[PDB]
Enzyme design. Structure first.
Site, PDB file in Angstrom:
ATOM      1  CG  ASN A  15       3.422   0.469   4.681  1.00 39.09           C
ATOM      2  OD1 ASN A  15       3.705   1.701   4.573  1.00 39.09           O
ATOM      3  ND2 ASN A  15       4.325  -0.405   5.003  1.00 39.09           N
TER       4      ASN A  15
ATOM      5  CG  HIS B  38      -1.093   2.715   1.643  1.00 40.54           C
ATOM      6  ND1 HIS B  38      -2.717   2.745   2.383  1.00 40.54           N
ATOM      7  CD2 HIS B  38      -0.224   0.979   2.755  1.00 40.54           C
ATOM      8  CE1 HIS B  38      -2.679   2.474   3.296  1.00 40.54           C
ATOM      9  NE2 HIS B  38      -1.730   1.230   3.776  1.00 40.54           N
TER      10      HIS B  38
ATOM     11  CB  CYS C  68      -6.333   6.084  -5.814  1.00 38.65           C
ATOM     12  SG  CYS C  68      -6.829   4.838  -6.854  1.00 38.65           S
TER      13      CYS C  68
END
Ligand code: 3M0
Ligand code: 3M0
Ligand code: 3M0
Lengths: 268, 265
Positions: free
Chosen positions: A190, A192, A227
Site C-alpha cells: 500500500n 506505507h 512515518c
C-alpha cells in the site's frame, strides 16, 4: 500452510533462510515479525480475502479502509537457527467493539515446544485521508464467523507483559540513532512504511555491546503515528534496569512521537 | 530444494511473500536478488562447502562479487511459485561465474535470468588474486563440463565497460546508511542492499509508470557498518536507461557503478 480442523486458526511451516539470520546464525526478531505478517496474510487468503488487498476484508475494500497496527508484543524463548523449521499458528478476535487482536504461537516443528508467542492490536484507517475510522457494525459481521467464539489468548496469564502501559522517554536519552529514513524496501504493497521497519529503528539505538552479549527476549511497541515516505526519524533509548530499555521514536524535525516501547534482554 | 540428477546444478521453489512485493503486488528486484543468494547458498551447502574450499581457508582466501547482471521478463506475483536453477562455471585464473534461470513453476516459461562474476581475495590484505590450480581443482568437479550460459549471447549486454558518472548527477539520494537488517551473518552489508541504494535515486515518476527490465552492477568496494552512502543517477536514453554511481558521503570513494533499463508499463 492450512486452516486448522475447526477453521478458526491457520498454521504454516517456514524454513529459516541464510539472509534471515544474524550474528548468532539464528533468525532476527525482524525476520520473525515478517513471518508473523506472512502467516497472518495467508490466514486472510484461506478465509476468502483475495490477494487484491493487503488482508483487507470485502467491506473494507468498498469503504477504502486498510488495517493499521496500534500495538505489537513479541516474546521469543528460542530463535530458530538457519535451516530449522518453525511452525506458526495464528488467529483473530474482536476486542469488544474497539479494535481487533491477532495472536500467534511459534513452535519447534519437530518437538512441538513453544519457542515464542506474539499479540497485536489493529484499528482501521481510510487509505486516502489516512484518518482512523470508527467501526459502526456490519464490518464485524463480515468476519465474526472466522474468529474463535470463546476467548483464545496467546498471553492468557494474569498481569502478563502484553498488558503493561508504556511511559514517554524523558530527554536526554542515554543512547540514540539519528536521521533514520525509510527506503523503497521498507514500504508495503500500500506504499506505507512496513510495521516491521519500526522494530528495526527502535533496535538501532541499542548499543552493539548489548546486542553482541545479550539476546532479545521481549519487545512491546506502541504505534501512535505513521512515518511518511519523506519523514526522518530519531531513535532514542534509556536503560531502565537482565537488561531493560525504554524506547521512543520521534520525527527529526518537530519531534512528533511516532512510537514508544520497551525491550527486555537476557545475557547469553 | 535439491541438486539436479547430474549434480551439476541446484533447483529450488519459493512462494512469493506479502512483504516481498511492491506496489504492483509482484516481487521487487531486491526480493529476486535475495532468492538468487539463497539458492546459491543452498547449492554450496549441498556440495559440502561453507563458499570456501579447504585450500582457500588455509590461504586466507574468500570469494567476493565483482559484478551482477539481472534481467526480468515477468516479476512473480504475491503467492506465485517461482523455481530457480543455479550453477557455477570456471573462468580459469580470473575467477568463477554463477548463473541462474527463473521460471514460472506452473507453465515452465523463463521469467528471468541472472549472471554474476566472483573473484578471489585474501581476507586480510584485501588484495585480489588469480585462482591457483590447487584451488580450481577443488571445485571443478561441481561445475558443468561443457559451458552453460544464462546469457548465451556472443556479444551480450551483460558484459560492457560501465563508465563513471560525471558530476553533476541528474538525480540523487544522499545520506543512506545501513541498519542491522541490511547486514549478513558475518556483519558485512548484504550485496542486495547496494541494489536498493542504487534504485533510491530513480525518480518516483519512473518507478510508478515503468518496470525494471535489466540491472548491471559492478562492486568495487564494500560499504562498512559505520559508512554513509550517496546514490547518484543520470539518464542516458518507451525505454529509459540510467547510469548509476554509489559513493561514500565523506571522501567520495566509489563503492559501486551500474546501469538500469526500464520499460513503460
Ligand atoms: C495486513 C496484515 C495482516 C496480518 C498481519 C500483518 C502483520 O504485519 O503482522 C499485516 N500487516
Ligand atoms: C477474522 C479474520 C480472519 C482472517 C483474516 C482477517 C482479515 O481481516 O484479513 C480477519 N478479520
Ligand atoms: C561449483 C560451486 C558450487 C558451489 C559453491 C562453489 C564455491 O566454491 O563457493 C562452487 N565453486
Amino acid at each position: 500452510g492450512s486452516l486448522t480442523e475447526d477453521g478458526l486458526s491457520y498454521k504454516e511451516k517456514f524454513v529459516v533462510r541464510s539472509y534471515e539470520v544474524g550474528s548468532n546464525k539464528t533468525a532476527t526478531v525482524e525476520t520473525i515479525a515478517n513471518l508473523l505478517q506472512e502467516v497472518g496474510c495467508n490466514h486472510a487468503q484461506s478465509v476468502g480475502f483475495s490477494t487484491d488487498g493487503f488482508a483487507t476484508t470485502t467491506t473494507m475494500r468498498k469503504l477504502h479502509l486498510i488495517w493499521v497496527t496500534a500495538r505489537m508484543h513479541i516474546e521469543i524463548y528460542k530463535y530458530p537457527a538457519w535451516g530449522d523449521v518453525v511452525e506458526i499458528e495464528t488467529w483473530c478476535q474482536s476486542e469488544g467493539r474497539i479494535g481487533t487482536r491477532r495472536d500467534w504461537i511459534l513452535k519447534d516443528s519437530v518437538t512441538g515446544e513453544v519457542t515464542g508467542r506474539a499479540t497485536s492490536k489493529w484499528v482501521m484507517m481510510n487509505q486516502d485521508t489516512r484518518r482512523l475510522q470508527k467501526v459502526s457494525d456490519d464490518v464485524r459481521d463480515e468476519y465474526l464467523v472466522f474468529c474463535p467464539q470463546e476467548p483464545r489468548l496467546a498471553f492468557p496469564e494474569e498481569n502478563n507483559r502484553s498488558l503493561k502501559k508504556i511511559p514517554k522517554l524523558e530527554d536526554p536519552a542515554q543512547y540514540s540513532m539519528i536521521g533514520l529514513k525509510p527506503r523503497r524496501a521498507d514500504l508495503d504493497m500500500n506504499q506505507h512504511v512496513n510495521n516491521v521497519t519500526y522494530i528495526g529503528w527502535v533496535l538501532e539505538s541499542i548499543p552493539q555491546e548489548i546486542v553482541d552479549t545479550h539476546e532479545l527476549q521481549v519487545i512491546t511497541l506502541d504505534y501512535r503515528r505513521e512515518c511518511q515516505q519523506d519523514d526522518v526519524v530519531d531513535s532514542l533509548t534509556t536503560t531502565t534496569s537482565d537488561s531493560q530499555f525504554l524506547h521512543l521514536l520521534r520525527l527529526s524535525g518537530d519531534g512528533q512521537e511516532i512510537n514508544r516501547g520497551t525491550t527486555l534482554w537476557r545475557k547469553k
